[PDB]
């Protein structure tokens, strides 16, 4: 019938839009994990540096 056409113009948009917004809610969240990981990768190198420098200084000093 004619009401069955109407349910199909909607039922198409409301999956196109909600599939799109579940891949932005994916995407932001993927970059959020890859940032936190990298802000701790730079933190890891820094600490190392400070320890290699530190020990050399105490060897020279002594």
């Amino acid at each position: 019938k004619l009401e069955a056409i109407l349910s199909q113009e909607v039922e198409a948009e409301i999956q196109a839009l909600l599939q799109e917004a579940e891949a932005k809610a994916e995407a932001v969240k993927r970059e959020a994990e890859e940032k936190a990981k990298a802000l701790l990768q730079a933190r890891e190198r820094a600490l190392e540096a400070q320890y290699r420098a530190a020990l050399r200084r105490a060897e020279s000093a002594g």
Binding site: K1, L6, S7, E20, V28, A32, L40
Partner: protein
Amino acid sequence: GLIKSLAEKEKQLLERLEAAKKEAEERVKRAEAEAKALLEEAEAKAKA
């Protein structure tokens, strides 16, 4: 065939769109907030 078929069907097609737009924004919303709170845990942890 009455006009009531398409009339009272149209005013449901509009509700189906509205929930679509809602729960699109209310989903991305969650992710943006969750991205902030995650990177706060990454600062809180990192300085300590």
